């Protein structure tokens, strides 16, 4: 009963018979009057066991005492009724038949096994054509398909020597006659002669098929079914309807069809029918059994009796409602309630209000146990009726049972990890689950009718797991970012803002108070309001370097409300925390500061107290909204009038015919957006600074106590866009086609729109509410795909001991610092030391966890970039170590070994899918005659260093773009030195002298023309596509020489001073001119969520940026074709590389410069396949992490980067082979990188040559299907494909992933169960 591997293979007919318990021989299911099953029918109890518990059919034996006997009048075996759903039947098929999975699961494995096309095999099994099996004559070669006319022609020609058959018996005899080892030896000798790509691919596919067959020991004859098995009868059950009519499953109908046609084929075979009739019935039997194996697969799916397609066995296994993803991964469960949620503000952080009725139902056997333990209940029936009478002793027993026994308040859609939290319930009357107001941010709950489930834990292990792991007071910080998730939200925030804000001269300002106790006595007495600026004596507590608490005391000039909140704030925090007005961000920073200063206990009790006082003082304010509270700026209609007047003037100038339609429309756009900005600015000023009626200093201007502005300014609800839409101008709404409407909505939601503006607004409304449907569907599919990629990853080792890692810089791209070094590097474990002076020559040790103190010291020393241990760099097979992962965010300290990293990262990535001086580098240049610095290289980027030595900004400069500055100078802000030609690309030189116009003759490579403006002759070069016969074999070169004609030598190299220019170059310089060094020579002119899905699925984009593959000098290799081949010949070795470029696709590099290993050749987006293939793993991880965090940074979503590193580490599991060494790997086999690693480990252990390889980057779908855990791939997708291939190869599953251990039903190898799993695996290895 203890298995440790699920072994799968094909089924021999002897194995199918040895499963079986008797042949079914009749299509009659049961009788219609006396509802017992028949003899040898589809439910026949002589085959599939008894019907009642310990009985026979005739009722002779009725007792356990006849444990197993055979009733002589019925033939049945008396057992328990469990064997009714565990016995199998077999069908003796008359003719052999084809398993449709091995015919239509592409590629069919028969079309690759017999090397015959699927159309020919389909025409054989459609009974339309014959194939000879063997022939002694020379006319008929082996496996030659013949039509019926050719068949009868062969009969009248020879008729005796050959044998041509038609149907599944023909391919069965062919599968018998095919010799596996002989044909694979023939393949191995026939492969090595020529190596063409497509035929070599088909040949190695066939060699892998044959080698898998001879490894597994299956027979190729076994693909043809001769004995079809029958499912147990209690899994295709028969319960009737309420009115006696019997409604079956689909499988009884399918089996009835195949059994009836098998009986008719039996009658026609022993009748010896004509061959046309018997082959027609064989056709119909074949079609019926192909329907049974997969209805909607071969042809017309046979529909049921109710005008719907029938469900086959494959349709009962695979699907969104198949067995796997419907009843194995997610099960309906006992001990579970559901109710409408409501708000309990009077709770604490760990409590929920369970109703009396649901709790009395859920804890019913616990109540039975306590009732029997207290001597009141003696039997189960008395306990049942005592609960169903609902006595006061039952209410007391329930009140004792509930006490500190948690319940899991799940909410679905449980998107991220914190959607299940366990609370200690308190009893309430009523009918609605009460939540804390802090956890309804984690749940994304709104109390407008959201329903939540209550799951109970039963065992002691589960109560301790729900107390110590899933409590609400343990998941304070989300695992997406170390910033707490119990933030006050909108009402506590309005209350704390109204507490800690201050007026000017409200009531009793300028008093001096002993402290918070006297201040709160004053406020509750009413002699001083909450906004009087006073002096208080605050005895704040500075916590020192160790855990000691000194007490300092001085006088602070604060508000009465801040002095009252300081009474709540515990001992250990400074006062500048509370000393300003507290918005939502300041309150969350209060909680985070309190966390990393004190711990987990005072932060919890401080969060509860801060919610209590926030609610109470929000109630004592009375922050109400009116129609006067949305003040409209009184200079709105004037600037609106001026804007419409000037846009009428521009429209009149267009209708006169001066300007054009596109420029007029863009003018309307910029006018109305500028007026919108003016109205919004005047609105926010006329809302922000309005409480000016003051006294006792003067008529002073301060920030306003307006209610709309207060609720938008504290961070409570809505922002400046929504306030602008209320009060100011609604703006330019958009048509659905991506356009902008000409006339904006000049009204707002206080004056009220007219008809036309509201009809305009409905465009954006319906576009948003269809956007949410498509957004949520695609985000859910991305989340499930990421989860089923990232199953196989857990913390396994304590340390992998490597020193590799990612050089981590603060990302600085664009125009602004995107992420600081703090939010980039905090949490990691340092790969090496910090070998730079900075300010103090700090050398932090390697393998060091980055605390906040260490982040502060490296920020003070201003280290430019740090190398850290990354998850993709780890050297542990089957999971990554702890030090390469770093800090677990939800606990603050390092990752405890066992915690399933991959599902954490999958939820935290796929969850916001519903939200969606100067420095020169790589420079070869020359100062020209004008001093304006040009650049002669392609990969030059301009850097902006700081006066500390770090970086301010970075920009990429194109080749030949001009630069006004030299190196090292400190240019001030406002100077844009970025100077570029927007349309053309320069082809500048670097030497000086005179030009000899060689290798260009007018007529076949250059066109004689003159510019129509200046009259100067220009010898422009024509492209090689329109040249004559004399221009198809030579490249024009501007032979730049000295004053006499000598081709000068460039110092450093030995190549001559020639410039192979391409076509479309506007050569304007003439002969006899002086050329400077660097002067111009000629001119040549030119979403979010699908972006994340396209980066993770690893697709090749629509315009692949072509890149270089090797170092060396580049030249052209093949001419006389529009596909220009490029010989990139190395400076030391030969070139085996060429390339095919499309005609319209241009080229950016020239054939005179030398590139490095993996240079950028063509521009645009580039595919992660080639990014990996030329650069390497650390570069492709940097690319994927930056490109995904661009999307999550634009929408404003905080995600720690090690999640995306985990997903890329799961994308990079495979590795294909460029050369074998001595291990058992042939060539190019997509095998797991861990097996290659341990194979090279043992080969270097015993001193061998080792096997080389090449990492390859698969997408999410191909990665999770290429996972060798076939249970994991079959639970994910393409179930017929993966079951067919695993059955062919004879695979076994090692049962090491969480998905297969959840299907099978043990503890998962993570979390708690990881200790048990390593104990069980060392016990199984130890004997």
């Amino acid at each position: 009963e203890e298995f440790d591997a699920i072994k799968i293979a094909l089924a021999s007919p002897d194995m199918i018979r040895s499963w079986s318990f008797g042949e079914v021989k009749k299509p009659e299911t049961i009788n219609y009057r006396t509802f017992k099953p028949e003899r040898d029918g589809l439910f026949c109890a002589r085959i599939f066991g008894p019907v009642k518990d310990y009985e026979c059919l005739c009722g002779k034996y009725k007792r356990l005492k006849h444990r197993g006997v055979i009733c002589e009048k019925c033939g049945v075996e008396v057992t328990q009724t469990k064997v009714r759903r565990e016995r199998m039947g077999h069908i003796e098929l008359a003719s052999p038949t084809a398993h449709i999975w091995f015919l239509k699961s592409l590629p069919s494995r028969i079309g690759l096994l017999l090397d015959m096309p699927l159309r020919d095999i389909e025409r054989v099994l459609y009974f339309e054509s014959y194939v000879v099996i063997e022939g002694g004559m020379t006319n008929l070669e082996r496996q030659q398909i013949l039509t019926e006319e050719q068949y009868l022609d062969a009969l009248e020609e020879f008729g005796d020597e050959f044998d041509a058959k038609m149907g599944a018996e023909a391919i069965q005899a062919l599968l018998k006659s095919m010799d596996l080892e002989q044909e694979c030896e023939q393949l191995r000798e026939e492969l090595n002669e020529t190596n063409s790509e497509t035929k070599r691919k088909k040949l190695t596919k066939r060699i892998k098929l044959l080698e898998a067959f001879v490894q597994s020991g299956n027979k190729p004859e076994w693909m043809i079914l001769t004995v079809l098995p029958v499912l147990p009868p209690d899994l295709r059950p028969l319960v009737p309807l309420d009115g006696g009519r019997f409604a079956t499953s689909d499988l009884n109908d399918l089996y009835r069809r195949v059994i009836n046609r098998n009986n008719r084929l039996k009658r026609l075979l022993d009748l010896a029918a004509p061959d046309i009739i018997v082959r027609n019935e064989k056709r119909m039997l074949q079609e019926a059994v192909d329907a049974l194996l997969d209805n909607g697969r071969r042809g017309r799916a046979i529909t049921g009796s109710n005008k719907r397609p029938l469900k086959s066995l494959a349709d009962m296994i695979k699907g969104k409602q198949g067995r796997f993803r419907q009843n194995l991964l997610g099960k309906r469960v006992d001990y579970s309630g559901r109710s409408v949620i409501t708000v309990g503000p009077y709770l604490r952080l760990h409590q929920c209000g369970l109703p009396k009725k649901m709790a009395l139902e859920l804890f019913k056997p616990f109540i039975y146990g306590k009732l029997e333990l207290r001597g009141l209940a003696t039997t189960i029936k008395a306990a049942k009726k005592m609960v169903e009478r609902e006595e006061a002793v039952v209410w007391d027993i329930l009140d004792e049972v509930i006490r500190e026994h948690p319940v899991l308040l799940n909410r679905a859609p449980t998107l991220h990890r914190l959607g299940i939290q366990a609370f200690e319930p308190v009893l309430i009357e009523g009918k609605a689950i009460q939540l804390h107001p802090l956890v309804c941010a984690a749940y994304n709950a709104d109390f407008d009718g959201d329903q939540m489930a209550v799951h109970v834990p039963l065992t002691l292990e589960a109560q301790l797991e729900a107390r110590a792991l899933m409590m609400s007071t343990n998941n304070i910080l989300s695992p997406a970012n170390g910033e707490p998730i119990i933030v006050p939200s909108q009402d506590v925030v309005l209350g704390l803002y109204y507490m800690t804000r201050d007026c000017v001269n409200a009531k009793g300002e300028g008093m001096v108070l002993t402290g918070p106790k006297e201040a709160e006595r004053l406020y509750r007495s009413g002699l001083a309001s909450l906004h009087a600026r006073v002096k208080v004596r605050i005895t704040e507590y500075e916590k020192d370097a160790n855990g000691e608490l000194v007490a300092k005391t001085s006088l602070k000039d604060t508000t009465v409300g801040r002095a009252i909140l300081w009474m709540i704030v515990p001992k250990g925090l400074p006062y500048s925390i509370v000393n300003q007005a507290l918005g939502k961000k300041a309150i969350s920073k209060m909680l985070n500061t309190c966390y990393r200063i004190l711990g987990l206990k005072p932060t919890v009790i401080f969060a509860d107290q801060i919610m209590y006082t926030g609610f109470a003082y929000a109630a004592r304010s009375g922050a109400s909204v009116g129609i006067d509270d949305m003040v409209i700026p009184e200079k709105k209609h004037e600037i609106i009038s001026e804007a419409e007047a000037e846009v009428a003037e521009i429209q009149e100038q267009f209708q006169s015919g001066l300007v054009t339609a596109g420029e007029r429309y863009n003018k309307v756009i910029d006018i109305w957006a500028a007026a919108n900005d003016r109205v919004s600015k005047a609105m926010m000023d006329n809302l922000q600074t309005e409480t000016v009626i003051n006294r006792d200093g003067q008529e002073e201007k301060q920030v306003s106590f307006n209610s709309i502005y207060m609720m938008a300014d504290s961070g409570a609800r809505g922002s400046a866009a929504q306030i602008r839409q209320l009060a100011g101008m609604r703006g330019l709404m958009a048509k659905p086609d991506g356009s902008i409407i000409e006339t904006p909505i000049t009204a707002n939601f206080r004056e009220g729109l007219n008809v036309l503006q509201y009809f305009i607004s409905t465009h954006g409304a319906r576009k948003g509410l269809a956007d949410t449907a498509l957004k949520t569907a695609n985000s859910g599919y991305l989340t499930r795909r990421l989860v089923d990629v990232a199953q196989d990853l857990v913390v396994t080792e304590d340390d992998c001991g490597t020193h590799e890692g990612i050089m981590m810089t603060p990302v600085i791209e664009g125009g602004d610092v995107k992420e600081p070094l703090r939010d980039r590097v905090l949490g990691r474990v340092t790969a090496e030391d910090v070998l730079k002076p900075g300010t103090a020559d700090i050398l932090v040790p390697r393998n060091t966890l980055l605390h906040e103190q260490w982040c502060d010291l490296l920020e003070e020393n201003s280290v430019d970039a740090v190398k850290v241990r990354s998850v993709v760099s780890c050297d542990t097979d089957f999971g990554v170590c702890a030090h390469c992962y770093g800090r677990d965010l939800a606990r603050g300290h390092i990752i405890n070994k066992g915690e399933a990293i991959g599902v954490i990262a999958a939820q935290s990535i796929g969850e916001p899918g519903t939200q969606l001086s100067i420095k020169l580098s790589n420079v070869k240049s020359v100062v020209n005659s004008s001093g304006k610095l040009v650049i002669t290289s392609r990969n030059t980027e301009l850097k902006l260093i700081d006066e500390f030595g770090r970086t301010k900004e970075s920009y990429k400069v194109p080749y030949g773009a001009v630069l006004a500055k030299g190196d090292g100078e400190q240019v001030a802000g406002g100077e844009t030195v970025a100077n570029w030609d927007p349309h053309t690309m320069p082809v500048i030189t670097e030497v000086s002298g005179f030009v000899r116009f060689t290798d260009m003759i007018d007529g076949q490579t250059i066109t004689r023309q003159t510019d129509e403006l200046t009259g100067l002759s220009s010898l422009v070069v024509l492209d090689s596509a329109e040249r004559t016969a004399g221009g198809k074999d030579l490249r024009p070169a501007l032979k730049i020489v000295d004053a006499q004609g000598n081709d000068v030598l460039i110092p450093g190299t030995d190549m001559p001073a020639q410039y192979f220019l391409p076509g479309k170059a506007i050569v304007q310089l003439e002969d006899g001119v002086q050329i400077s060094s660097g002067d111009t020579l000629a001119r040549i002119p030119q979403g979010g969520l699908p972006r994340v899905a396209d980066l993770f699925e690893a697709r090749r984009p629509k315009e692949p940026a072509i890149l270089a593959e090797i170092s060396g000098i580049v030249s052209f290799g093949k001419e006389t074709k529009g596909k220009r081949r490029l010989v990139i010949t190395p400076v030391d070795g030969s070139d085996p590389y060429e390339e095919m470029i499309p005609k319209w696709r241009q080229l950016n590099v020239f054939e005179g410069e030398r590139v490095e290993r993996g240079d950028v050749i063509s521009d645009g987006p580039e595919a992660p396949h080639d990014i990996l293939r030329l650069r390497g793993v650390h570069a492709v991880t940097r690319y994927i992490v930056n490109e995904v965090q661009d999307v999550y940074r634009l929408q404003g979503v905080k995600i720690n980067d090690k999640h995306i590193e985990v997903i890329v580490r799961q994308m990079l599991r495979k590795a294909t082979i460029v050369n074998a060494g001595s291990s058992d790997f042939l060539e190019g086999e997509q095998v797991e990188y861990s097996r290659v690693k341990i194979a090279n480990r043992e080969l270097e252990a015993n001193g061998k040559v080792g096997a080389t390889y090449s990492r390859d980057l698969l997408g999410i779908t191909k990665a999770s299907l290429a996972t060798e855990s076939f249970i994991s791939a079959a639970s994910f997708q393409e179930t017929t494909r993966v079951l067919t291939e695993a059955a062919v190869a004879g695979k076994r599953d090692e049962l090491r992933g969480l998905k297969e251990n959840v299907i099978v039903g043990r503890l998962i190898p993570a979390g708690t169960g990881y200790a048990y799993h390593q104990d069980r695996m060392r016990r199984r290895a130890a004997g």
Binding site: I8, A9, I317, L329, R332, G369, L458, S621, V1302, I1308
Partner: protein, 149 residues
């Protein structure tokens, strides 16, 4: 026009009046908006919504509990919640939620009897839906079995 109507009614023209507090007697600091909004009551009643289940009916094919308030069934602890328990690490909670609280007849009978006797202990077993999957692949014609050790 609304402020003209309010001036006819002898009311504060802005609509905001100065409410008191019935709890502690004293005054709210700022004027509160008060009027008469027309509240409905929708067809989502909490008596129809609330439902709980301890141990009840069971399906025929998969031997896991039913679904729906009419059949007194339990909440589906779906795939997303299985990932939530996985990424917590509550392996014992996930195992007891997929075997003894669900489709495993011997384990759930030992569980019910043990909870009534007071000792919360768990004897697991292979789930009935996994046995259904084994019978369905074996009837499809692919030999799948449980290899020991």
């Amino acid at each position: 026009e609304i402020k003209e109507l309010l001036k006819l009614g002898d009311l504060p023209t802005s609509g905001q009046i100065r409410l008191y507090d019935g709890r502690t007697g004293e005054q709210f600091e700022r004027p509160v908006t008060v009027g008469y909004m027309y509240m409905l009551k929708l067809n989502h009643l909490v008596d129809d919504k609330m439902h709980a289940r301890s141990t009840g009916s069971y399906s025929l094919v998969t031997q896991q509990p039913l679904g729906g308030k009419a059949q007194f069934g339990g909440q589906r602890f779906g795939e997303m919640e299985v990932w939530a328990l996985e990424a917590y690490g509550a392996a014992y909670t996930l195992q007891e939620m997929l075997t003894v609280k669900s489709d495993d007849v011997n384990g759930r009978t030992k569980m019910y009897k043990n909870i009534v006797d007071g000792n919360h202990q768990m004897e697991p077993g292979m789930p009935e839906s996994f046995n259904v999957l084994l019978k369905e692949i074996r009837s499809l014609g692919i030999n799948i079995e449980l290899e020991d050790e």
